[PDB]
Amino acid sequence: MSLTKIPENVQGAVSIDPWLEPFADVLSERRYLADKWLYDIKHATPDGSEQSLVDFARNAYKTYGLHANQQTKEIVYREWAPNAQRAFLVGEFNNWNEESHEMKHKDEFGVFSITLAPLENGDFAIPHDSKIKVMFVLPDGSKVYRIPAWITRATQPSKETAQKYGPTYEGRFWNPPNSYQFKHQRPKFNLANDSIKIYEAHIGISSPEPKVASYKEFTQNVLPRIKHLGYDAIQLMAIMEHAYYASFGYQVTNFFAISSRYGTPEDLKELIDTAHSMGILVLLDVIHSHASKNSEDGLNMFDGSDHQYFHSLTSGRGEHPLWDSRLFNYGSFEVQRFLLANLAYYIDVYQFDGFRFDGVTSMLYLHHGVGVDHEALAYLMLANDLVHDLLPESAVTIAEDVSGYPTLCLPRTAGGGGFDYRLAMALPDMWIKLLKTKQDDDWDMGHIVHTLTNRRHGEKVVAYCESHDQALVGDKTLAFWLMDAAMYTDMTVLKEPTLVIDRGIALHKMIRLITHSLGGEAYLNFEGNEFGHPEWLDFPRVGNNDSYHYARRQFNLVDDDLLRYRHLNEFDAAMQNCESKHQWLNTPQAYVSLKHEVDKVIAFERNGHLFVFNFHPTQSFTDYRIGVDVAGTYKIVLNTDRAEFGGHNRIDEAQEFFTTDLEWNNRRNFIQVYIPSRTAIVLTRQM
C-alpha cells in the first residue's frame, strides 16, 4: 500500500514516458548525484560563494596549462600532479636543464606552479613553438618526463628525433606573434526550431591525394563543396590530438591540442571562421569516454601514480575491455575540472558550436556495452549543463550511444541526460540487411516504416543511412552494396547504364531521402557518400603497409559532368536545400498514410509536406492515389527522377496537383501522381 512516489526531480521524464515509472527512484538518484556535483563545482571558489558553471570551466583553462602574458612578457605554468614530489619545467629554452626551473610551489590541491620572468632582452622566456616537457621527481627519487596535460600543441617527432628517442610526440609552447582574429559571427541557429543537417568530415582524408591534407586545404577546397550541398553543420572528427592516425581520432593523447598533422591552431580557427562566414555550424568530436594508454605524450601514469586521471588497474575499473585505453575517474574533482574546461576551451578558443560525445555507451555502463555507471553519466549531465550554458538556445550536443539508454536526450530539468540528439546508430544495418539478404520484391514496407519511426518520445535523433563506421575497412558502403566496384567506364553518362547501375543510382537517392524525411529529427552524411564515393576508407596501419591509398576522398569525381557521381551529388544538394526551404527534420513525426506491401509504395505527410516513395523493383504507377489532409494545390519540390540527379526525367515537375474532396487512406482528400518504378517525390502545398 506504499504509494508509488515519483520524486519531483524526475517528474518531467516520467510524464514524457510513463514507462519510466518503476525506475523513477534510480533515475532520481542518478540526477541527484549530478546536481550535487553541480553544487560542488559552483561553490569551488576562494570564499565558497556561488559562481556560474561557465566561469568555473573558463577560469580552469585560463589558469591551467601554460599562459604567455603578452603585456608583461611573463609566462605562467601550473600542473596538477599530487603523487609527484617535485616538478621541473624543461625544454629547448633551458637546454633541458633539470635544476634551473623548478616548480617550487605545490598547492594544497596538489598543483605545481612556476612563473618565468621575461629575458633581459624582454623576450618571452620560451621561444614560440619550441619544445618543452615537465619532469616529475617521485618520492622514491626516480624521474618521469611528460607533455603538459593542457598543452595546446603536440607534434610528431622528426625522422632524426624518432630514430634517437622513438615515436613519442613532442610538446610545443604555442605562442604565435599574431594569433588569428575571428571575423565572422556564429550562424543564426536555434536548436529548438531549426533543422541541423550535418556533414561528417575528417581533415586528413579530405583530398584526392594519399597524404594528410591540411586545415588550409579543407578551408579552401572542401568548405565550398559543403556550402553547395547546403548542410547546416560540419561534424569534425579526429581533431583532438591523437598519435595514432588509424585510430580515426579515438585514441586521444593530448586533450587540449588540436591535431598538428593538419596544421596549426591558427589554421583551424580560420577554417571554423570561414565556415561561419558561409553560414555553417562546426561541431567537434569529443572523446571523453577514455584516453590513450600512452605515457609521456599521454596521461597514463602522468604523475607516476596509477590513481590520478584514471581508475587504477587493480580497481578493476581502470581499463577498457577492447580499446586498450584508460578509463577516467569522473569522481575526482580535478578530472571533472579537466574535462569540463576542455569543453569550454573548444567552444571559446576555436568557436566550435557544439559537440558529439563519442563512446557514450562505454561510459554509461559498468561493463561498457561488453549496471549504469552513475559517475560517468553524471559527468555527461554536467557536460550538457556547461555546453548549453556556453551558447544558450543554440548549442548542440549529440550522443553516440548505441544502447539507446532511456532519458539520455531528455532535458536535465526533466531528469534526463540533457543531450539534444542521439545518433540513430541502428538505421544503417536495416539497409544492409535488405541489400544483403532480401531481393527487391521481398522488401517489407511495414518493417521499413517501423524501423525508421521507432524513436523514443522526446529523444530527438540524428538519422543517417550510413556513417563513418560503414565507410571504413571491414564494411561495405551503400554504393558498394548497390553497384559493387563500378569503374569510370561503368559510370559514364555517354552510355545507358546497366540494370545494376540504374538500380543502384535510383536506390541510392531513395534510401537517403526516406532516411532524411522519415528516420529522425536531424540528418548526417559521412564525407563522400553524398556522391556515392567508390571503394572504402582505410588509414595507414601495419595491416596495409601504411598505405594512404584509401586515406583520401576522390572529390574530383563530383567535378566530372560525364560521370554519374555528379548526379548523386546534385541530388544531395537539392535534398538539403529542399528541407531548408520546406522544413521537415526538426518537426513531429510523420503521419504515414500508406505502406502498401504489394505495390511497394510508402507515402506520408510531415509538417504539411507530401512524401511518396515507389520502391517497386519493376512496376510504374499512373494516377496513383495519395491521401492528403490539407486541401489545395500541390507542386513537386524534389524529384529523384530528375535528369540532373541521374534519373530518366519521366515525371513532370511543372504539374499542378489539385486535391479532390473524397476520402482516401483515412485522409479527407487525395491527389493522383505518376511514380515510375524506383522513384520518389516530395510535394508542397501552394499558398
UniProtKB/Swiss-Prot annotation:
**Catalytic activity line of the entry:** Transfers a segment of a (1->4)-alpha-D-glucan chain to a primary hydroxy group in a similar glucan chain
Q: Where is the active site?
A: D358 (nucleophile), E400 (proton donor)
Tell me which Gene Ontology terms the entry assigns under biological process: glycogen biosynthetic process
The relationship between pH and activity is given as: Optimum pH is 7.
| UniProt site (Transition state stabilizer) | D469
Which superkingdom is the protein from? Eukaryota
Task: Cite the CDD domains for this sequence.
Answer: AmyAc_bac_euk_BE (cd11321), E_set_GBE_euk_N (cd02854)
Could you tell me which SMART domains the record lists for this protein?
Aamy
Which EC number(s) does the record attach to this protein? 2.4.1.18
**Where does this protein chiefly localize?**
cytoplasm
Sites binding (1,4-alpha-D-glucosyl)n sit at: W96, K133
Q: Which GO cellular component terms, listed alphabetically, does the Swiss-Prot or TrEMBL entry include?
A: cytoplasm; fungal biofilm matrix
Function field: Glycogen-branching enzyme participates in the glycogen biosynthetic process along with glycogenin and glycogen synthase. Generates alpha-1,6-glucosidic branches from alpha-1,4-linked glucose chains, to increase solubility of the glycogen polymer.
Name by which UniProt lists this protein? 1,4-alpha-glucan-branching enzyme
Name the species this protein comes from: Candida glabrata (strain ATCC 2001 / BCRC 20586 / JCM 3761 / NBRC 0622 / NRRL Y-65 / CBS 138) (Yeast)
